[PDB]
Amino acid sequence: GQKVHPNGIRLGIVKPWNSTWFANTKEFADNLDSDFKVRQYLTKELAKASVSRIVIERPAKSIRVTIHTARPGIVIGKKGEDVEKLRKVVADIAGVPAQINIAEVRKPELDAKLVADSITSQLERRVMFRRAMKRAVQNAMRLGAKGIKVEVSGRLGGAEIARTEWYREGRVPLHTLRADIDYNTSEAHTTYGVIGVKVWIFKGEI
Amino acid sequence: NQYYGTGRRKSSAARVFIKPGNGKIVINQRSLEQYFGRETARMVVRQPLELVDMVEKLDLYITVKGGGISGQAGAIRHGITRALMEYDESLRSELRKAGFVTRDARQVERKKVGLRKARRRPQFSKR
Amino acid sequence: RSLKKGPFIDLHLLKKVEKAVESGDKKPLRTWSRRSTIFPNMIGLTIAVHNGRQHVPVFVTDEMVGHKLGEFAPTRTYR
Amino acid sequence: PRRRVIGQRKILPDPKFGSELLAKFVNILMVDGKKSTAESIVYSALETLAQRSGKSELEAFEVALENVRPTVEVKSRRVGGSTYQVPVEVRPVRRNALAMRWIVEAARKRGDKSMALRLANELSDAAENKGTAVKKREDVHRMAEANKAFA
Amino acid sequence: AKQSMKAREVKRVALADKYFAKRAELKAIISDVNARWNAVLKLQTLPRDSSPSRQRNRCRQTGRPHGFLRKFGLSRIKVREAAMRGEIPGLKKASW
Amino acid sequence: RIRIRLKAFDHRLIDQATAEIVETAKRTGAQVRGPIPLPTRKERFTVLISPHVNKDARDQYEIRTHLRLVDIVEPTEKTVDALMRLDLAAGVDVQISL
RNA sequence: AGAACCUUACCUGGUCUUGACAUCCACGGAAGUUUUCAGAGAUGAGAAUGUGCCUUCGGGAACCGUGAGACAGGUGCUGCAUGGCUGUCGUCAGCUCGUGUUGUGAAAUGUUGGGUUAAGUCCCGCAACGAGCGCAACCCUUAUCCUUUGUUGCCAGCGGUCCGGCCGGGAACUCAAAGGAGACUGCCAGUGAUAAACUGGAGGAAGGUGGGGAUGACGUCAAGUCAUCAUGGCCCUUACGACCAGGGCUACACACGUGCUACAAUGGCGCAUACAAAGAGAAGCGACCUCGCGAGAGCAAGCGGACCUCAUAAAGUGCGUCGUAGUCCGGAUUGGAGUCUGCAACUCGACUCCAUGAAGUCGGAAUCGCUAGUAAUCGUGGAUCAGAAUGCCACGGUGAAUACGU
Ligand SMILES: [Mg+2]
Ligand SMILES: [Mg+2]
Ligand SMILES: [Mg+2]
Ligand SMILES: [Mg+2]
Ligand SMILES: [Mg+2]
Ligand SMILES: [Mg+2]
Ligand SMILES: [Mg+2]
Ligand SMILES: [Mg+2]
Ligand SMILES: [Mg+2]
């Protein structure tokens, strides 16, 4: 299948940023390397922490890294026990004096990456995909989310052939530019096959 | 007081002035015939001044930049019609029929991917 | 034509040419470098040029100074 | 052109003489979208026409063009497996359009020096008819009358 | 993308400062129409992998040697995957 | 003298950053001519949309670089205070040169 | 989005086997910066200096060397196991689900009709009533005006003038880009079931989705990509791995596609002369100046960029020459002699100089695209990149013909 990627198309219209930083073309290639390099360690450390997303930025020979999360307790911990260890290694990789922020995302079902990580983590547990997809659906209109849909791709119940079998409930306007569409792609690490997890979440009109 | 009118034609910005004096044409500190306008688009500058009682009516100073030959020529055509604000909204009503007040919305088309230039799809082998 | 001022050659092969003059010529030397050019001092000395299989015995002659070593070993075998 | 009927857009007239007929004529002669070099040939041909024949300026080419107007043309049917030619009355807008085309196409086949001269020689032999355009105008007419059956 | 070729690349890039850059001042000003001696041209027995325009300039994430833009420092496939996930600032669908 | 040239990528970010610098300067001081719009450089790239084959299908990209110029004509010792370090930088680059 | 080494996988040789790269154990050595001999190089074998931030003495973190097993490694196999992404039918207007009803049931109805539209667009009707995907709208750019702003941009009214916006100064305007207005069949006329809509006119810079782009439904072809990456299984594992030199990827009795340059007087050649936009630039673009016929070389300001640089845009136009020929048409091919990039131009380059001047004189059947700033033609720039575009992407100049019809 062929579609426009919901997150990228909505950058100009109704998303804030995945990167607010400015840089000149001389150091842009080396700066963009360090932004993906820090996330490789950070996503590994915040795998069990259930990270939604993080915003990289570098205000004039510095670095912030605004970290959102579903679970603020495991990220912060007691005082700055787990905060100082994260901030230390970011300064070493980036090669600059690093700060750190905190942010609690209320209603984790509303985020795409949190629901995508929730569904794909159950695939290693070896539960039925029909129920795993439906558990995301069952709490849709209860708290926020005016529309939502989920799609799985290949290896459905350990089958020999690759099926899709997507599911939808509510209004998911995919090509309406003004509409707020939250989306993120995820993949499974299961030893019986690779299952892709796509989830489209619609919050509101404006 | 001076009398102003802009006009343009295919990315060719012009600036027309009109005063009551002599009929000499000054364009970029140069004469009308010495602005090389011999072939097609020779009198498109004086196209909006065709159907008027003229004899030797007006001074004019015009300066145009951007585009080529006909782009700069057609900018002066539309530029003078806006500069008729000395005569105001009376004489424009007859000029509506000619369609020189109409700014032409036709612009050069962008180049497209998988096409040679904007429309031309490159040929392919048989069926 | 090429190489601008000065005839560019390899260092290791220049020592083999000086070996052939000082210590004297014995047999055709097996050289992998095709980059060097023939000189007057290389006249009357047996050399051998590699070309994807084995070194071909190329005999050096007075008028070969104008061309490179690589020209005299055809790489692609035909017929 | 199935649903959408056209607006028939009007080109601008000839800036020297004021003939809208010659504005279409210069466009047929034009190759590679060069209107400047096109009219230079056309004006050079028209000056030699009126000088040689000794007639007026505007009506020299008009009477020459009037002689090369086609009376009728045919249209290919392809309905029931057999190709039928049906004669139809050409419109005044299409009449001079095809006439101006066959003057340039007839002049293109000549072996003379300049495009101004060879086209002027075609205009010279339009009034009294020995040329290639006057041979080109009568082609469908020989097929016509026989094809009057289909109407 | 064959991690040995990236290991060969990391070697290739790491020799640019040592053998050349500093000591590549030889042949630039020295080998010129001055005052000849050919002993400066006999300094080219160096390892050669240090060469200033030797590297293919592979993509930093995967190691594809195709579609490498100097601006982003990534291959064409990784440009679309990155750009649609944001990350490059002020980047969106180009239409004019 | 007080020639300050900015850079920002977003279609509307610098418009609010170049607003706050104006009313801070002109209130206590005087003059302050205002923000010059300046021509936007647009670096247009094009890359292949498919990982294999497909010459006809591609994706186009652009990065608009919007510049601004402050131009304060009045160098007073009061207006230089409360200018530096109340910018609250949102990734907008600032430079102090002729 | 670019095979001269490298890239590069593949081949003939020369080599290494816990390996080039990563974790861990034991043991020694700071790492590293110096040089010489041998070899094509990978590399072994020496002579130097150095021996640095923690250490109740078993040691550390960086890195190097040796040895032992878990392993590392695979651009190898399978896109008839897959993820991700993509072509095409198609920017075609369709494709479905809740409840309800119909038939015993597959299914139907909704979404059968009557008008209308680019469109399942909208109206009326209906055993269906609603909802959702798609379409449209929202968006970027372009056509116009107003407000905000006046440097590096611009020069009217003023003067000072080396006749250069160049220098006060003036801020109008062009240009530039933040925020707004405006175009909604709404104002009017006619037709139409009085509704939708259609035709025409007025106003307006732009009238019936304004032009163009982004935007590609549910699914199909077990379509393409295990070779970008990720990844199931399978297989090699002192080798299908790894390092290095050279070679090949550029071959040649052939066939086809996609482009460029032509067969010329709407043109060639020479002199003179006028008008662009979009860009890119610090390991960079390179004035001005001098040298060379030239490609370029040396010297060498300025600008991280509305300033400075590439950049003297060409068609076109003003005179003259050529007057239908295989020619001052065309440039292939070959020889001699050069420059540039780089360790390196022989296989296997770009570009220049002199000379040579194949075929071809409008191309068989057949076949391809395009409906307006379009076809076509003439130039410029960028990405790739040390250095190789006639490809590709981006931009502008000149600028049509013909649409009766299905
Ligand atoms: Mg790997
Ligand atoms: Mg390379
Ligand atoms: Mg290779
Ligand atoms: Mg295949
Ligand atoms: Mg049905
Ligand atoms: Mg509908
Ligand atoms: Mg759309
Ligand atoms: Mg398939
Ligand atoms: Mg010739």
Swiss-Prot record, chain A:
GO terms for biological process: cytoplasmic translation; ribosomal small subunit assembly. Signal peptide: none annotated. PANTHER family: 30S/40S RIBOSOMAL PROTEIN S3, SMALL RIBOSOMAL SUBUNIT PROTEIN US3C. Keywords: Ribonucleoprotein, Ribosomal protein, RNA-binding, rRNA-binding. Residues 38-106 form the KH type-2 domain. It comes from the Bacteria. Part of the 30S ribosomal subunit. Forms a tight complex with proteins uS10 and uS14. With proteins uS4 and uS5 encircles the mRNA as it enters the ribosome, which may play a role in mRNA helicase processivity. Some nascent polypeptide chains are able to cross-link to this protein in situ. In collided ribosomes contacts ribosome rescue factor SmrB. Binds the lower part of the 30S subunit head. Binds mRNA in the 70S ribosome, positioning it for translation. Plays a role in mRNA unwinding by the ribosome, possibly by forming part of a processivity clamp. This is Small ribosomal subunit protein uS3. One of its GO terms (molecular function) is rRNA binding. GO terms for cellular component: cytoplasm; cytosol; cytosolic small ribosomal subunit. Belongs to the universal ribosomal protein uS3 family. The keyword RNA-binding applies. The keyword Transcription does not apply. InterPro entries: KH_dom, KH_dom-like_a/b, KH_dom_type_2, KH_sf_prok-type, Ribosomal_S3_C_sf, Ribosomal_uS3_bac-typ, Ribosomal_uS3_C, Ribosomal_uS3_CS. The gene is rpsC. NCBIfam families: rpsC_bact (TIGR01009). PROSITE patterns: KH_TYPE_2 (PS50823), RIBOSOMAL_S3 (PS00548).
Swiss-Prot record, chain C:
InterPro entries: Ribosomal_uS19, Ribosomal_uS19_bac-type, Ribosomal_uS19_CS, Ribosomal_uS19_SF. SUPFAM superfamilies: Ribosomal protein S19. GO terms for molecular function: rRNA binding; structural constituent of ribosome; tRNA binding. Gene3D superfamilies: 30s Ribosomal Protein S19, Chain A. PROSITE patterns: RIBOSOMAL_S19. Keywords: Ribonucleoprotein, Ribosomal protein, RNA-binding, rRNA-binding, tRNA-binding. GO terms for cellular component: cytoplasm; cytosol; cytosolic small ribosomal subunit. GO terms for biological process: cytoplasmic translation; ribosomal small subunit assembly. It holds the Pfam family Ribosomal_S19. The keyword Chaperone does not apply. Part of the 30S ribosomal subunit. Binds S13 and L5 and cross-links to the A site tRNA. In the E.coli 70S ribosome in the initiation state it has been modeled to contact the 23S rRNA of the 50S subunit forming part of bridge B1a; this bridge is broken in the model with bound EF-G. The 23S rRNA contact site in bridge B1a is modeled to differ in different ribosomal states, contacting alternately S13 or S19. In the 3.5 angstroms resolved ribosome structures the contacts between L5, S13 and S19 bridge B1b are different, confirming the dynamic nature of this interaction. Bridge B1a is not visible in the crystallized ribosomes due to 23S rRNA disorder. Protein S19 forms a complex with S13 that binds strongly to the 16S ribosomal RNA. Contacts the A site tRNA. Belongs to the universal ribosomal protein uS19 family.
Swiss-Prot record, chain E:
Signal peptide: none annotated. GO terms for molecular function: rRNA binding; structural constituent of ribosome; tRNA binding. One of its GO terms (biological process) is cytoplasmic translation. One of its GO terms (cellular component) is cytoplasm. The keyword Glycoprotein does not apply. Keywords: Ribonucleoprotein, Ribosomal protein. InterPro entries: Ribosomal_uS14, Ribosomal_uS14_bac/plastid, Ribosomal_uS14_CS. Belongs to the universal ribosomal protein uS14 family. NCBIfam families: PRK08881.1 (NF006477). PANTHER family: 30S RIBOSOMAL PROTEIN S14 (PTHR19836), SMALL RIBOSOMAL SUBUNIT PROTEIN US14M (PTHR19836:SF19). Binds 16S rRNA, required for the assembly of 30S particles and may also be responsible for determining the conformation of the 16S rRNA at the A site. Part of the 30S ribosomal subunit. Contacts proteins S3 and S10. This is Small ribosomal subunit protein uS14.
Curated annotation (Swiss-Prot), chain F:
The lineage of its organism: Bacteria, Pseudomonadati, Pseudomonadota, Gammaproteobacteria, Enterobacterales. Belongs to the universal ribosomal protein uS10 family. PROSITE patterns: RIBOSOMAL_S10 (PS00361). The keyword Transcription regulation applies. InterPro entries: Ribosomal_uS10, Ribosomal_uS10_CS, Ribosomal_uS10_dom, Ribosomal_uS10_dom_sf. GO terms for cellular component: cytoplasm; cytosol; cytosolic small ribosomal subunit; small ribosomal subunit; transcription elongation factor complex. GO terms for biological process: cytoplasmic translation; regulation of DNA-templated transcription elongation; ribosome biogenesis; transcription antitermination. GO terms for molecular function: structural constituent of ribosome; transcription antitermination factor activity, RNA binding; tRNA binding. PANTHER family: 30S RIBOSOMAL PROTEIN S10 FAMILY MEMBER (PTHR11700). The gene is rpsJ. Pfam families: Ribosomal_S10 (PF00338). This is Small ribosomal subunit protein uS10. It comes from the Bacteria. It comes from Escherichia coli (strain K12). Disulfide bonds: none annotated. Part of the 30S ribosomal subunit. Can also form a heterodimer with the transcription antitermination protein NusB. Binding of S10 to NusB is mutually exclusive with its incorporation into the ribosome. The rRNA transcription and antitermination complex (rrnTAC) consists of RNAP, NusA, NusB, NusE (this protein), NusG, SubB, ribosomal protein S4, DNA and precursor rRNA; S4 is more flexible than other subunits.
